[PDB]
């Protein structure tokens, strides 16, 4: 389904389920990298 | 000895500023409180 940004949304990405606001990320993600995680297991950043 | 006492008092006050600045551990007591709280909170988050 079409990506939605700047609004609370329930998101299932490649079998990963979470509810959070989606915003564009200025993170310099390395190409090999697919997920960015905080101290907690929850995924801070995701690649489409 | 009013004049003498006044000079002594003024001199002592002047040193106070220098003392706190030079001694990094001067405010260690206050700093400890901050660290302990932060430390505890990090642990809680890590446990998740």
Swiss-Prot record, chain B:
UniProt region (Heptad repeat 1), positions on chain: 2-48
UniProt superkingdom: Viruses
Reported function: Subunit of the fusion protein that is processed upon entry into the host cell. Mediates fusion of the virion and cellular membranes by functioning as a class I viral fusion protein. Contains a viral fusion peptide that is unmasked after S2 cleavage. This cleavage can occur at the cell membrane by host TMPRSS2 or during endocytosis by host CSTL. In either case, this triggers an extensive and irreversible conformational change that leads to fusion of the viral envelope with the cellular cytoplasmic membrane, releasing viral genomic RNA into the host cell cytoplasm.
Protein name as it appears in the record: Spike protein S2'
